[PDB]
Symmetry: D2
Subunit: 232 residues, 4 copies
């Protein structure tokens, strides 16, 4: 319920920092909520990967460094590469293929005549749809939920490195190449080219890594706009 | 908490608590005859393990599995183990971690005799668990170790799942020779910084469990009941 | 040399379709047709067999090799596979400071070909520097055998890295495609520096799909460009 | 034919190391050495340049190509990469019922070369059937260009499937066993049937990568033997 939302907000803002131990009574007091919803909130946020359970009881706010962000992006890329390869090997229905191709055609409409001209917000929304469609493309529920789970951490999400404030020249310029990769993923799946589909979908996740590296080096003010990046 | 986890897992895997059954901490506490505090932890831990799903309106639901789920889970474990192998090959491995896994590989070789059938199956199964735990931790990333171990958390996704004690038969002992050659190649590829090879061999290695599953279905159906949760699957 | 001149002339006659696919060639008849001595012709026939433009027949003579669209696509695929091999081996084995500095310089020069508009691309400069980049990539791991085999896989007129970048292909659609191709050049070098062999191989192999896309664009949208790629106009199943 | 006999004799002399790497060969002096006419010697020297055993010199004539241990390893690497490509393309494009039946028959026949003990292996039977399996794999996708390039990548004596099998057998050089090699043959076919291109490429590449581990063990651990082995004696190191 609302206990999950409030607790999640306090973890993501760094208010409850990594390594902080949390107990049902002391957390219920901190949030000013009953123990029953707090119990559910602590357990749900362990399942989400924001907290770890301690031996002997209680919870601890999970610590994330830059290396964890890079590894989580790498795991999303590996899992998205798996969804793409399995769709290419097993085949995709006419309908599912038509839907993902429609999203790709829609994403092309985000790009103007100059290298800088990109509808950043439209791209970010359509990009989420494309990645959800790719995760479900092979028709396996197990694959879909594992791909979605690898994309569940705030900084591991496909549109995590495209926040509203990152609508700048350098990030927009990068989206052209990223969209060419969306097209190649679909073309490889259609052609039953599993190795290519996996290779492009895995490489595509290096765009978020390259963006993260740009935020660290050239635009540190952007770090705070990425969900989860306030935890680092 | 841990005892509640064990008992609840047993009741799900036996089909006593069938797929689609809604569970609550009060009714589960009553059924297991355990306090609600350990039950609450057991329900949440078994959601993380993938045996239960949380319901939006409260409570939990026992997850249902088909043959396709078993095959996909093994595929995901192999993909993740392939990732651990590639990252250890690209990033490098400490002298100590390398010495430890190599010791496991040397001990695994001692399980094989002169005849194709002469195989210490039980020794192999125990050392195989160690080898796969060492591989998950090899690159030194806690995030990778955690995600590889999670991928191996389903009863049928585990590296040892398709090596139950009763599967100690000719056909299985013969297959272990090639599986051991794959363990050696994984370590050799990592040492040589050959990431593409390390990933390819570790991913292929997981196909051994898929072949074992297919052998159980077609040639030895009596073995199905030896793999946790496999007997419940109807397709 | 007399041998090298016979090679040039004979290659020109094969690529123009003057000596069509399936035509049987012998020393005497080739020497007569080129109006050159038998000694350089013998060398030219053997060198063009090694290049893949002729096949040896059981009997001492040769035959002009016939190519279809499937051959063009497979040749580009083999180049991408071999360039992916050169990239992976450079990433696994390591690259010398000097070789890395040289290929980084080519990548930096290639970036200078791109302007502010998606269309603003120095096409001719890109085509020349692209050849250098691909020669440097073939030699990057330091193996002579690998360099030799990668170069051979890039030896057909339509399998070469700048085959699908003829001077007349300097049009909007091609200039826009070069931006993504250059990002791939950068990623190949970055993956090699990071010892990321799987990534290096994946990007280098994907990079060769740019030529395949250029080919498909020539067939569907710009048929006038087909005749600009050596030997392409001969192919009847485009 | 006179030409073909000159090719065979010259190839034998290069492979044995009798004509070592770096040795310059000229038409008249080579014709005198082999005791053969001018016309067949021209064909032999040109054919062996096309095969990659000789290189042409800038001023005219030929030179026996030098191969060191690093060249052997790189040639096997190129072979594995090309065979991995043949396997992946067969898996992606699909194979006919007939071609699949033929290659599966070869795999079943290869099982017949194994006895109850690890050392109980019919090496000569295995070598012959293995060559067939690799020829069938190269042609499986139906592309003449791919078939041709895979065969070219497998043509150097030390990169050829089934090369030096009795020699490896003598010294226990099957570090990756022949049973493991046969399990890889089965997995290649199974991956192609299943349209699993990434798996087919990975297993076919590993199949050759492990063949190089075996040949490395031999060259390094048996130097006293390789100087008498045709196809290895020519190695310069
Ligand atoms: Na409950
Ligand atoms: Na309800
Ligand atoms: Zn995307
Ligand atoms: Zn294992
Ligand atoms: Zn290029
Ligand atoms: Zn073989």
């Amino acid at each position: 319920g609302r206990a999950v939302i409030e607790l999640r907000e306090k973890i993501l803002s760094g208010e409850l920092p990594g390594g902080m131990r949390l107990f049902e009574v002391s957390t219920a007091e901190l949030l000013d909520i009953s123990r029953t919803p707090v119990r559910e909130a602590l357990s749900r946020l362990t399942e989400e990967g924001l907290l770890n359970r301690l031996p002997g009881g209680g919870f601890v706010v999970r610590r994330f460094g830059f290396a964890d962000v890079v590894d989580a992006i790498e795991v999303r890329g590996v899992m998205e590469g798996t969804a793409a390869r399995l769709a290419a090997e097993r085949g995709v229905s006419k309908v599912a293929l038509e839907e993902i191709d429609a999203t790709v055609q829609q994403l092309d409409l985000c790009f103007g005549d100059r290298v800088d001209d990109v509808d950043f917000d439209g791209y970010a929304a359509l990009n989420r749809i494309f990645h959800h469609q790719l995760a479900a493309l092979c028709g396996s529920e197990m694959i879909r939920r594992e791909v979605e789970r690898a994309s569940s951490l705030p900084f591991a999400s496909p549109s995590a490195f495209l926040p509203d404030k990152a609508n700048i020249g350098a990030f927009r310029r990068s989206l052209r190449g990223a969209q060419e990769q969306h097209k190649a993923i679909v073309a490889a799946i259609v052609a039953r080219e599993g190795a290519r589909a996996e290779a492009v979908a895995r490489e595509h996740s290096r765009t978020a890594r390259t963006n993260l590296e740009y935020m660290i080096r050239e635009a540190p003010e952007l770090i705070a706009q990425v969900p989860g990046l306030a935890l680092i």
